[PDB]
From a paper:
Mounting evidence indicates that CRISPR and Cas proteins represent a microbial immune system that protects against invading foreign genetic elements, such as plasmids and phages. Csn2 is one of four Cas proteins that comprise the Nmeni subtype of the CRISPR/Cas system. The results of the mobility shift assay indicate that S. pyogenes Csn2 has a non-specific dsDNA-binding function. The tetrameric nature of S. pyogenes Csn2 results in a diamond-shaped ring structure with a positively charged inner surface as seen in E. faecalis Csn2.
The crystal structure of S. pyogenes Csn2 was determined to a resolution of 2.2 Å using multiwavelength anomalous diffraction. The asymmetric unit of the structure contains two S. pyogenes Csn2 monomers, three calcium ions, 204 water molecules and two ethylene glycol molecules. The monomeric structure of S. pyogenes Csn2 contains six α-helices (α1–α6) and nine β-strands (β1–β9), and is organized into two domains. In the asymmetric unit, the two S. pyogenes Csn2 monomers form a dimer with approximate two-fold non-crystallographic symmetry. The close proximity of the α-helical domains of the two symmetry-related dimers indicates dimerization of the dimers, resulting in a S. pyogenes Csn2 tetramer. Six calcium ions (four in CA1 sites and two in CA2 sites) are present in the S. pyogenes Csn2 tetramer, compared with eight calcium ions per E. faecalis Csn2 tetramer. The only CA2 site in the asymmetric unit of the S. pyogenes Csn2 structure is located adjacent to one of the two hinge regions in monomer A. The calcium ion in the CA2 site is coordinated by three residues (Glu138, Asp142, and Glu150) from monomer A, Asp118 from monomer B of the symmetry-related dimer, and two water molecules. In the corresponding hinge region of monomer B in the asymmetric unit, we were unable to locate a calcium ion. Residues in the hinge region of monomer A are structurally stabilized by the calcium ion bound in the nearby CA2 site, which is missing in monomer B. Such heterogeneity suggests that calcium binding in S. pyogenes Csn2 is important not only for its oligomerization, but also for its conformational diversity, enabling calcium-dependent conformational changes in the protein. However, the results of the metal analysis support full calcium ion occupancy in the CA1 sites of the selenomethionyl Csn2 protein used to determine the crystal structure.
Residue numbers in the entry:
A (entry chain A), C (entry chain A): 1 to 39, 42 to 47, 51 to 209, 214 to 219
B (entry chain B), D (entry chain B): 0 to 39, 42 to 139, 141 to 219
The structure:
């Protein structure tokens, strides 16, 4: 896909992980703003990328990777992990039947006439309170987690990181780029300065280290 | 055992077991029914130790079909109750613990396998009970719903008195009898507030002047 | 409109306030039930009356006349009462402008740059906490209030009172019937015994006191 | 006045007025930024009386455009604040009371006229303030939003320290200057955490070994 705005000679292609450097403070500021307020001067497309289809990250530690929407997707994912393990899943079914059986007995014994449905694997997973751990995150760890929840969000097409290179070591930028490619994601890193020596675009428009 | 008293009453009307109280004057009937709804006040219910029966200890029914046997208040009581049955069979509890610890590891196993750094807390018995969807079985007549209400009333130990308002009009003579039989066996204390005599069962009758007579003893 | 079910020789017409007596305990019970569970053996129509279009009252003191939906209608009603009093409404506008003016001044004086919209009559009415008083109701008073909120509910077509005559004096039944007719309502009173000497239907099917 | 200290620091870095702290090593920068987010802990902020600055007394910003000047937390503070301005002008309060009592009667008048038996409570100043929809005016640049954030930070007396993270990258030299001027006039205590030197302003610079030098004094 592509980024374009009127002052570009030609669209900036966005394939996999793209590092875009805006060395002029005023233009760094304006482009970050247009991204933030995308709806618009700046265009991503040759169908246009809707606003809802873009996720923008400026505060890494503050970004919520444990939204109801994401947890649902994680939990579903975990359940589907069992569908590749018929032997183990069947055992779980048997453990839950035994549990169900002990509970239904307590129901019979209760003075009330009680009824019930069933306990599901998904319900067990929800009850266990599974979520992404983030309390201890380093900034790099959290970047990875965002990438990883991003992959679940089939609706979202572009992830944009704002001014994040400053927090990452060379090997860390390396590790993130590698994960992006392995996962077929599309991610834009908006930077105010050249980010080490990775392939990257620079508007003063050139490319460096290809 | 129990007592119903207020200002205009010559004597307190005793509530023992199932009691049919006929308020023959419309105005008296409405007054008393209204007072029950407004209980907090003019009219008093108290046990034999002269301890007052509190609002919260009374269950007041006029809309039989509407009464919700599966109210959140009730379901929470039951789920808690089920959990506690477990907490009194240490061997069964132990079994529950082993099964949940194992299902837990198996799930956490998939968590580790997952790309994401995942944490979690624990699965509790209450959570299993709530996930299984335990609830009170649900009755295709008003008489049948009355029995159910009685069963719930007996289940709820904190509710001490059940008042049915104007329900006689819905019950055959055999049904009234079935009701009072259940009430007898299970030792309930139930007040049937009626606007007129209810067949020929023993019952109190209170006239225009709040004078009490019994009938069919 | 009409009530019908298979055991009737002919539909029972429902015009204004109708008293229907079911002297057989078993049939009183069954018909109350079918009303309760209307969706169905019992028919009200020659288009059929949808279930949502019927309001059923068995517990008079317990019925909620202060629902969000009703309050909205009451409050709107009150506002529209002002639209027939241009002089007074204009004065209220002037009182509220003065209020607005004192508040906006406090806004100017506040260190923050503050903005605002306007205070409306409807907002004043909501803020005042206007609702039907019910805490002290006698059963008769409450019957009247239900009738009175019923009139607001343009969607609802039939109100049914179950076994309520027992609570009402002759003059009270009289007063309710009178209000029903004056307000062009349609109301069914289901009774287990003859209700004094009003015009009424009786299934043992006859009419009495016409 | 204020101090930033922790384990690896030779000396505590003083926070007086507007402070630009350059952490030149990526790892140090990330470590410190991460520690600010996790503040509750390794890193300490304390005033001159050695009283600790609490989590709640710090305002930590990285996402400038995202900061919500009209948060429910803030709006409640402001509305309360507006009410209290009234409670200190007895003559104006008095005027407010008269106007509300009159509008009230006029409304209650329509209530009496209404068929329904209507009750009500009262209209309060807070309710008028909230009905009028008072809120903070809203800025079409990041620099402009920074000023707004500073204005809010000054307004919130319980917030004692403001930390901007990596915001230098967005500001021209004249804008940084405008910011620190506002901070000076209004006496704010602001920490700018930067990954590299910020133009040629006075600033602390902390190296790989947590040795501190000042620059451009
Ligand atoms: Ca289930
Ligand atoms: Ca983590
Ligand atoms: Ca849990
Ligand atoms: Ca408004
Ligand atoms: Ca009233
Ligand atoms: Ca109020």
């Amino acid at each position: 896909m592509n980024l374009n705005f009127s002052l570009l000679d030609e669209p900036i292609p966005l394939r996999g992980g793209t590092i875009l450097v805006l060395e002029d403070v005023c233009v760094f500021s304006k482009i970050v703003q247009y991204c933030y307020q995308y709806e618009s001067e700046l265009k991503f497309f040759m169908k246009t990328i809707k606003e809802s289809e873009i996720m923008l990250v400026t505060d890494i530690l503050g970004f919520d990777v444990n939204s109801s929407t994401i947890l649902k997707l994680i939990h579903a994912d975990l359940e589907s992990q069992f569908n590749e393990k018929p032997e183990v899943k069947s055992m779980i079914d048997k453990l839950v039947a035994t549990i169900t059986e002990l509970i239904v007995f307590e129901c019979l014994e209760n003075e009330l006439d009680l009824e019930y449905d069933e306990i599901t694997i998904l319900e067990l997973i929800k009850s266990l309170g599974v979520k992404v751990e983030t309390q201890s995150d380093t900034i790099f760890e959290k970047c990875l987690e965002i990438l990883q929840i991003f992959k679940y969000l089939t609706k979202k097409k572009l992830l944009i990181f704002v001014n994040s290179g400053a927090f990452l070591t060379k090997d860390e930028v390396a590790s993130l780029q590698e994960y992006i490619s392995l996962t077929n994601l599309t991610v834009l890193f908006l930077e105010p300065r050249e980010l080490y020596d990775f392939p990257q675009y620079i508007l003063d428009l050139i490319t460096k280290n290809m």
